[model samples]
Target: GLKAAQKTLFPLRSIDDVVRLFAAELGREEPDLVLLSLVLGFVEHFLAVNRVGLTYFPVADLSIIAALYARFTAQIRGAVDLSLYPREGGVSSRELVKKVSDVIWNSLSRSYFKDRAHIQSLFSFITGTKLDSSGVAFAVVGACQALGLRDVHLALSEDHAWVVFGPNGEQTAEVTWHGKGNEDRRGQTVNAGVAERSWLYLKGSYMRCDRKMEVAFMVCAINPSIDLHTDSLELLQLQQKLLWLLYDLGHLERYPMALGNLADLEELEPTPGRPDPLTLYHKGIASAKTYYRDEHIYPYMYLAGYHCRNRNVREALQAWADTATVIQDYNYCREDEEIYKEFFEVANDVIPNLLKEAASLLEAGSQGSALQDPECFAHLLRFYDGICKWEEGSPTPVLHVGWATFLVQSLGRFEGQVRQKVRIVSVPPVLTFQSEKMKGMKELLVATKINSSAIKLQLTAQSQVQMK
Candidate 1:
């Protein structure tokens, strides 16, 4: 009755007020976590079916949100088999949370592709038949909150999601499947991953959220992306406004990816009086450095991506050099398949786009903002330098001849005036951070044995720059 009355007062008619309420609600000590999920879920569900839902479901009617909320509470409470869980009096146990997981995991249709998009929300879980990886994880957290478990919260790594709950907030459990096997990790801690030095695990650098930051995470997960090159501008505006509200509330400073996601939106449709994308990207990067110990890859990737698009190749390359530095300690794995595509895109797509301009750039002045020649070459060395070192120590190899093939072709773009400045100092791979004494390196070229397999091509990701 209380929820019904509350829903009556704030129906979807005034979504602006609803949004402001969401922002206002976060200021309280006890925010309605159910409403938070339903709010985001409502808007996302609307987006998923907007162009197609023309027949019914009024744009202003939010009753569907109420429906999703009702159905969710009903099942998490009913399907939980109350006898086993009991009318829980003491702190909500992990078993209760697992039962919550069982309700979600088992209700999933017997035969449906798990990888579908826009299905990672409560709206989809109740309405659609499938829930993606993070969706299941989020569903568990929201359900636990519904069951009045204040201690249980979401735990996130670079690649997966789980929960942590205890009197002291120390206990951890896997609520959903991740990576290839879809392994059931319920009631088990992922601590062994720390000793493995696995990038997927981040070696213990994952984030634990309070109520406010959990909202921030879900808000950040609001994806407007419809395709590789397209997005819903309205959805983007909604996400951007929510992020700014949270940012003004000071919720984004410690969280890197949230900040970066905001910066990415600002780059596309910059809001007035907001800091430029460059400024926000650095703030995101610095947070990653300070809190995450530089384990985050996307902050730098976002920074470089902005730089790359802006035609500032030097800065882009340097940012990527920093990217290489962050993950140099990490090994390659299938969970890294997402990052791997980025690696290939950098080599094949972005590099090609950059070098494509160099020919005409040579005809012009050392003029525009873009870096001209040998420094760009040096940037290439350091750029590849970081990842090469990363590959060397890893149990699995990250690069193939395709990496060399792209670099060799791009290397062909720079004239000897630039190429001659770099030297292939073939020795053991000494990890190269940024150095000032590159006068010799400016005159030399670096190539390595790795290039041999790429075509017996005269290129080496390991080749170092030395002062001539």
Candidate 2:
């Protein structure tokens, strides 16, 4: 994060400069695309996992949905039936199914039965008991394998532990077998070392399941869509309902099982190439500054001019004039009546009265007296109130809070005692790439600082003279 104080003093120009410098230093190979890709993949994997799990189980009249899935299964090129008995590798299709079933039984029933109690427990924790269904257990196992979570086993206590093997067999998650309460208990001890929260658990489960499903779908070439009969609309509805449930459990942040799901969503579409995250962040900053000019700054400066008895009103009017003059110089507004009219209105209506009041204050030597004036105080109050409201309502809370604080500090400089107590550190004038204007701006900064310093020194000298 950029320092709040630096941002206030430097304005957005510094960020723009930094961004350009960083980009120049970094290779110029389509930076925005990298950011877009990362965002896409993350969201994709997130939605896909939850959707797959949701289609598997259909309680609360999910039979129709299951039937539709079955229909889809039949239509697909090579949809594996979870409930089908294993078969041997013989000459016939029945024999092949039997061989496959035997292999599955041998794999699953070696230490554990082909029962789905543990899987149900895992599913229930994420999406309530009514929606707890794990249709593609074997497929899920395959998906886990794809994500490098090997050693799929029923623990000593019959808990389904996804033994994730890194360099040395690191266990990622341990799914509890049976019981609603124990489901949460398994999670409590799963990744106990790190701070594991509820939303993380739900998203994690969804991502785990979804990433696995995606792998299975890819490896097995399983089509996702389900077909239904005309009267079997209830089943279709159930499928849709389950899809939503899965999405909620997996994608929604509140659910404990969904943390990993969030990761999967981000991982779905790989960005074409990795680019610097900081470059994009700064570009956004620069774009925002251009769109939203600092409207509140003018009001605060007007109040500052009113109280400090400084030439703020004259300066503001001059700034506005300079802006138009520069535009005209650039040949951007040739004979543009509206532009000329606006310039005239501000100069004639707004600047003259402000300049009169400012000049009166200067003549009276009433810097402190001006602040005590009801009208001046009212303007200050209004400016502060506007800033407070903007800070509360604005989407960019950081900028609002930051700039408002800076303005308040600037306002505090009006009092003699306050000025004595506080040391003012003036910011250097903003840098410009425009070579023609740069020298003039630098000269103005030096001259303004010298004049302001001379006044402060004279005031200090008077305080000493009064003491004598």
Best by TM-score: 1
| Each candidate's clash count | 15, 40
Candidate 1 per-residue lDDT over residues 366-443, each given as its tens digit? 554233455666666676656665665556677655776776666666665545555445343233443222223322
Tens digits of per-residue lDDT, candidate 2, 173-268, equal 333233233333322244432222111221123123223222211111111223232222222232222223333333222222122222222233
Using all chains and alpha carbons, the TM-scores for the candidates as numbered come to 0.84, 0.17
lDDT of 2: 0.27
> Looking at model 2, which ten-residue stretch has the lowest summed lDDT?
1-10
**C-alpha local distance difference test of each model:** 0.70, 0.27
- Stretches off by above 4 angstroms in model 2 are 1-330, 345-349, 368-438, 444-468
Q: Score candidate 1 by TM-score against the native.
A: 0.84
lDDT of 1: 0.70
Model 1 residue 436 lDDT score: 25
